A paper describes a structure:
The serine palmitoyltransferase (SPT) complex catalyzes the first and rate-limiting step in sphingolipid biosynthesis in all eukaryotes. ORM/ORMDL proteins are negative regulators of SPT that respond to cellular sphingolipid levels. We determined the cryo–electron microscopy structure of Arabidopsis SPT-ORM1 complex, composed of LCB1, LCB2a, SPTssa, and ORM1, in an inhibited state.
Each protomer of the SPT-ORM1 dimer consists of LCB1, LCB2a, SPTssa, and ORM1 at a 1:1:1:1 ratio, and the transmembrane (TM) helix of LCB1 is swapped. In each protomer, a pyridoxal 5′-phosphate (PLP) cofactor was covalently linked to the ε-amino group of Lys311 in LCB2b as an internal aldimine. A ceramide molecule is sandwiched between ORM1 and LCB2a in the cytosolic membrane leaflet. The aliphatic sphingosine and acyl chains of ceramide are coordinated by numerous hydrophobic residues from both ORM1 and LCB2a. Unlike either of these, the N terminus of AtORM1 (residues 5 to 8) forms an antiparallel hybrid β sheet with the N terminus of LCB2a (residues 1 to 5) in the AtSPT-ORM1 complex structure. The potential acyl-CoA binding pocket in the AtSPT-ORM1 structure is partially shielded by Met14 and Asn15 from ORM1.
Residue numbers in the entry:
A (entry chain B): 1 to 36, 42 to 475
B (entry chain D): 1 to 156
C (entry chain A): 50 to 480
D (entry chain E): 36 to 49
E (entry chain C): 1 to 47
The structure:
């Protein structure tokens, strides 16, 4: 699924083994110096080896504090050590870098003159948020008006909105499935989905990432073998897939997945976290870009953090599914309602996207998010880099493959006034370290042109042009 | 200066600890580390090739045994210590026995001991040791020695 | 060689590609959800203009007892300036997890302010109130440990207890005699093992019963068996101590005896979020290995810039704390003579519980019985109250009842109007 | 005492 | 940077020496220089 140059797959294992060897050696001279209030230690000796022997070496590439709105250009605060690199502290000095590590695709995480004036007015009339849950006193009028805009937008009959995009997967999967069920998940699913599956009693299998000929062969075996020990019938089967598989940048093969789930009478659980304002000619997600009937999928989970510039989540489906969840979902019963100015800013963003604001800049954003991604991705391939994903996706990871290139590609770019994101080993597979580039609809062409020459010059030093240029 | 592209497939294996041992390039590095240690030993202190192969076989004993058969658990806290009563050898391949990658790891301590004996003229000063080392390695990797301990030493 | 082998059956003949097709056709799945009923679909009130003591529903003015703002900070004139000045300078969204670029400076200031308020080395923020317990407990307790829970802990805590695949044993609700029995029986079954970790999970003011935990016997039994204490003081932070510090200042114990202190800012601070407090080593370890901290968007900065102002208001004005005790006592002096209900809360917690006496039947029936009594309190004489809404995923088995979240902004007329209206309705429906 | 081992280990390998 | 200075930098990141401290790097560079001199001097005339 990823083409790896053979000579680089060898100098990566060597680079990791050298780190392992020096780390064990150094940790062996700490265990004999600890000779100099009775409870067990907070953490054992060797459960955080790669946290203190690999992460602390490059800890200045993460948790960079900014002091400006998440815009195309922000200010980055500078940090010193003051005690030989153990606890970084922040100065007063700042910079002015190009934002390429945020998520605001449509450029809503800013001050725009249709949403912020309405949200400020919906603040001084409702005071932040209610202190009760939604079934007691936290269902304001704004919370009832917003659950209609989401149903109109997404397309399904009814929807529920929560206040966290991570609790939208750990507090719902236990409700729909329980013990005796099955969950054929995709390999590269978020942590929230797997934690939600663990919170119930269901069994989890995994089919190969983004290929249906392997999804069929797993369903056949699992229905022909029943429960793992007492070969009862499987009470249910649910298949979980994602719209755009981030950190791989690929659009899912939805038409070929739904067709196989219908045949074996399994259910489908879609996850449009990255693809609900980005892809599509109207912004309706993958079910519109790929031309699939929205009633073939049973549940559709989403998130407003990335595109609409406001926290939250939702679930949409048949009108009895929503009635069941509103009566038996712990996140709906026990948790405080989503704040009011954080719901007005979703209402007034869906109005802009649908063009009901009077102006017509709801289509300029949708066109400029595409004419920027198709340009950046095309230009990176011509210089010989290795970028993944298709042509219609806001994310494009660049593969690095070497643990030592992670602090080299980031420190140079920050020094030349460009900010990016890099991902290491403990989170990713060992061999696949990458950098993630996020392109928004607020970047101008003059910025992408200037940022491509900064990247092309840094990529010569590290030698990450694995493919041949022209 | 880059050729020989390989299209690696992701084996699920759902375990950070023992999934990296399936991507292309592991065997070659495994052997090149051994061939690199052999040359570096007889450069920092000029000696006979036989002894140097002996020092390589003795260093490869402690490193491999302490890593594959002594340590238990995983260094990643994400799985909430699901594998606390298992060693790295037992976690491999979800407990599947006699696979392609287990036979390669079984076959190396033998072939490396043959080389350290055939160039040291057997004798007894080194023969006694090398035999003990290879014997310990091969016994520890037997299919029947699965989740079984010796007198309950480092067993629970 | 042979005289030692084991008898085995010959291997079976594998299924054919035709037989499998049949089995895949006989199999039938159950419905995704159970069929709906008519008692399953009651809509809650939709209100306007506030959520404070005096809200508004359908035009008529009702009196609120279901919002958990104890200090009456909803709609304070000093919070609507802070939020406004930070909402037009940062935006309304976070745009990223906190490890990549989601660390605004206001987050660091808020953490410093909270830690200075409680007097502790360091502190950590979380995005959402209910998820501060999903991720704190599985971070500390792994599969080989032992946790001594309280059998009366809400769903947030008891979801984390299940995620962290450890061994959980319960003890009777606020029964130090049953706590010490359990501690001894654990310190005997685990004798040779000494590297394992042991934790005690409690709650400052319980939400299902309104009873304050006694933090003297717990801090004393913890020093005798080498345990650790995790305290969930979301209902006591800012209301309970004499200066507002919480349970520790209530029982006059040093805060260093409590290993982890977690709270939610959605009750007495009039914001959203959560935080966790402790020494430097504990906090800096869960800043990297947590789950809801590294995989979730950070707090919107306008919510974290209101917590700072709220804490400053609390610190500068300790009179609204005694004004709350008076209101709780005033509601207790006008409700002790009810007919079928029974005040089963503590005398100081601002959650006036009311257990129903002489259970009318099965718990299923009692739920709707309480639901209609709660419905008629609003429709007729304009009163919002809360009734126990259990889920089928919850495992708590405490008695159900009706709560009343008293605040510090209630008047003296509405406070007794809440008592007369409950006495009449309880009299004319239960007995 | 030198080729019995090298002959038996080949058999063991196979 | 010139050609030799650039080709040294490209070597530090490929074998993971860009991350280590000065004392971990000076203990490996010397140990690999020794190996390149030993191979040269011997193999150049031992055949
Ligand atoms: C200088 C060149 C190398 C110098 C010595 C390097 C030896 C280090 C390799 C040891 C492999 C450890 C396998 C499992 C270890 C587990 O116990 C622990 C905790 O459970 N897992 C982890 O820490 C994470 C699991 C994966 C991390 C492995 C990173 C190292 C990747 C290298 C593997 C492929 C290259 C070597 C193949 C196996 C090496 C065999 C030892 C060679 C002996 C050298 C003595 C001359």
């Amino acid at each position: 699924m990823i083409t790896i140059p053979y000579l680089t797959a060898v100098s990566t294992y060597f680079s990791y083994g050298l780190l392992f060897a020096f780390g064990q050696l150094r940790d062996f001279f700490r265990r004999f110096i600890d000779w100099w209030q009775g409870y067990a230690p907070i953490c054992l000796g060797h459960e955080d080896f790669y946290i203190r022997r690999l992460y602390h070496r490059i800890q200045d590439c993460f948790e960079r504090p900014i002091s400006s709105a998440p815009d195309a250009w922000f200010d980055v605060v500078e940090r010193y050590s003051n005690d030989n690199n153990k606890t970084l502290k922040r100065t007063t000095k700042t910079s002015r870098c190009l934002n390429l590590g945020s998520y605001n695709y449509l450029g809503f995480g800013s001050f725009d003159e249709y949403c912020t004036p309405r949200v400020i007015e919906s603040l001084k009339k409702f005071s932040a948020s209610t202190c009760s849950s939604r079934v007691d006193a936290g269902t304001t009028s704004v919370h009832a008006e917003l659950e209609e805009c989401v149903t109109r937008f997404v397309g399904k009959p009814a929807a529920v909105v929560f206040g966290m995009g991570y609790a939208t997967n750990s507090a719902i999967i236990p409700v729909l499935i329980g013990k005796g069920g099955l969950i054929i998940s995709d390999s590269l699913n978020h942590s929230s989905i797997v934690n939600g599956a663990r919170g119930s009693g269901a069994t989890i299998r995994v089919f190969q990432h983004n290929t249906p000929s392997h999804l069929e062969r797993v369903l056949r075996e699992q229905i022909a073998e029943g429960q793992p020990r007492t070969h009862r019938p499987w009470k249910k089967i649910i298949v979980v897939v994602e719209g755009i598989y981030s950190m791989e940048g690929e659009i899912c093969h939805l038409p070929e997945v739904v067709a196989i789930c219908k045949k074996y009478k399994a259910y489908v659980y879609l996850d449009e976290a990255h693809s609900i304002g980005a892809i599509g000619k109207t912004g309706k997600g993958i079910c519109e870009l790929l031309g699939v009937d929205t009633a073939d999928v049973d549940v559709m989970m989403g998130t407003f953090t990335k595109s609409f510039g406001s926290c939250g989540g939702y679930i949409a489906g048949s009108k009895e599914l929503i009635q069941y969840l509103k009566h038996q979902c712990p996140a709906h019963l026990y948790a405080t309602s989503i704040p009011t100015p954080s719901a007005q800013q979703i209402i007034s963003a869906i109005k802009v996207i649908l063009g009901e604001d009077g102006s017509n800049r709801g289509a300029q954003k949708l066109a400029r998010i595409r004419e920027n991604s198709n340009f950046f991705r095309a230009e990176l391939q011509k210089m010989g880099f290795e970028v993944l994903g298709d042509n219609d996706s806001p994310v494009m990871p660049i593969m690095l493959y070497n643990p030592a290139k992670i602090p080299a590609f980031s420190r140079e770019c920050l020094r030349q006034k460009v900010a990016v994101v890099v991902v290491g080993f403990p989170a990713t597979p060992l061999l696949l370290a990458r950098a993630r580039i996020c392109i928004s609809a607020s970047h101008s062409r003059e910025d992408l042109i200037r940022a491509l020459k900064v990247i092309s010059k840094v990529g010569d030093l590290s030698g990450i042009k694995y493919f041949p240029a022209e | 200066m880059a050729n020989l592209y390989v299209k690696a497939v992701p084996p699920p294996d759902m375990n950070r600890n023992t999934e990296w041992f399936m991507y292309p390039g592991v065997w070659t590095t495994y052997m090149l580390i051994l061939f690199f240690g052999w040359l570096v030993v007889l450069s920092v202190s000029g000696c006979s090739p036989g002894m140097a192969w002996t020092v390589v076989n003795l260093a490869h004993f402690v490193v491999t045994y302490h890593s594959f058969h002594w340590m238990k658990g995983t260094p990643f806290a994400d799985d909430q210590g699901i594998y606390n009563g298992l060693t790295w050898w037992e976690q491999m391949d979800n407990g599947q026995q006699l696979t392609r990658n287990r036979k390669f790891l079984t076959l190396v301590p033998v072939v490396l001991y043959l080389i350290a004996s055939h160039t040291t003229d057997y004798r007894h000063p080194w023969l006694f040791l090398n035999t003990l080392a290879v014997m310990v390695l091969v016994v520890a990797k037997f299919p029947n020695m699965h989740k079984v301990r010796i007198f309950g030493i480092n067993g629970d | 060689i042979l005289l030692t082998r084991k008898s085995y059956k010959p291997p079976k003949r594998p299924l054919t590609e035709q037989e499998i097709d049949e089995l895949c056709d006989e199999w039938v799945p159950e419905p995704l959800i159970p069929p709906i009923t008519e008692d399953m679909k009651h809509e809650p009130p939709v209100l306007e203009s506030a959520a404070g003591p005096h809200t508004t529903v359908n035009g008529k003015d009702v009196v609120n007892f279901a919002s958990a703002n104890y200090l009456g900070l909803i709609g304070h004139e000093k919070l609507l300036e802070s939020c406004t000045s930070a909402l037009e300078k940062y935006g309304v969204g976070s745009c990223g997890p906190r490890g990549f670029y989601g660390t605004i400076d206001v987050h660091l200031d808020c953490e410093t302010r909270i830690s200075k308020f409680l007097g502790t080395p360091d502190s950590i923020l979380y995005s959402y109130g209910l998820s501060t317990m999903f991720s704190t407990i599985p971070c500390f307790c792994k599969k080989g440990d032992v946790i001594v829970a309280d059998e009366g802990v809400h769903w947030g805590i008891q979801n984390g207890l299940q995620l962290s695949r450890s061994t959980i044993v319960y003890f009777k609700h606020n029964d130090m005699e049953s706590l010490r029995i359990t501690l001894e029986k654990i310190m005997t079954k685990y004798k040779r093992s000494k590297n394992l970790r042991r934790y005690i999970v409690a709650e400052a003011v319980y939400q299902n019963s309104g009873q304050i935990a006694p933090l003297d016997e717990i801090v004393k039994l913890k020093e005798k068996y080498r345990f650790r204490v995790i305290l969930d003081e979301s209902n006591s932070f800012g209301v309970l101590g004499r200066s507002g510090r919480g349970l520790a200042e209530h029982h006059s114990v040093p805060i260093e005896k409590i290993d982890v202190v977690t709270a939610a800012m959605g009750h007495a601070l009039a914001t959203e979020g959560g935080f966790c407090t402790g020494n430097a080593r504990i906090i800096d370890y869960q800043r990297l290995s947590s789950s809801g901290y590294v995989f979730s968007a950070s707090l919107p900065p306008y919510l974290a810039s209101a917590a700072i102002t709220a804490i400053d208001v609390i610190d500068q004005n300790p009179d609204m704390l005694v004004k709350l005790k008076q209101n709780v006592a005033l509601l207790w002096k006008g409700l002790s003579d009810i007919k079928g209900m029974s005040l089963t809360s503590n005398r100081e917690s601002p959650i006036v519980f009311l257990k129903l006496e002489k259970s009318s039947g099965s718990a299923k029936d009692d739920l709707l019985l309480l639901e209609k009594m709660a419905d008629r309190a609003l429709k007729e004489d304009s009163l919002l109250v809360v009734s126990s809404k259990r889920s089928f995923l919850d495992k708590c088995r405490l008695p159900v009842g009706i709560k009343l979240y008293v605040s510090a902004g209630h008047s003296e007329s509405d406070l007794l109007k809440a008592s007369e209206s409950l006495k009449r309705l309880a009299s004319e429906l239960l007995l | 005492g030198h080729f019995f081992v090298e002959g038996l280990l080949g058999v063991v390998i196979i | 940077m010139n050609w030799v200075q650039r080709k040294i930098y490209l070597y530090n990141v490929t074998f993971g020496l860009y991350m280590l401290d000065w004392w971990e790097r000076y203990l490996f560079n010397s140990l690999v220089v020794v190996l390149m001199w030993f191979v040269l001097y011997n193999g150049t005339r031992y055949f």
